[PDB]
């Protein structure tokens, strides 16, 4: 689905964004690496 630590996470206005749970890094537009 995602690349190595990404996963789909999401804020408490409802806005869905991706996150890196082994980097701490985000983004707004779906990761590759
Ligand atoms: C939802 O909130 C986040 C920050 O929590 C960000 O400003 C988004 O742009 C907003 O839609």
Redesign the pocket.
Do not use: E, H, R, S
């Given at each position: 689905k995602l690349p190595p630590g990404w996963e789909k996470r999401m804020?408490?206005?409802?806005?869905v964004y991706y996150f890196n749970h082994i980097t701490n890094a985000s983004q707004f537009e779906r990761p590759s690496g």
């Open positions: 804020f408490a206005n409802g806005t």
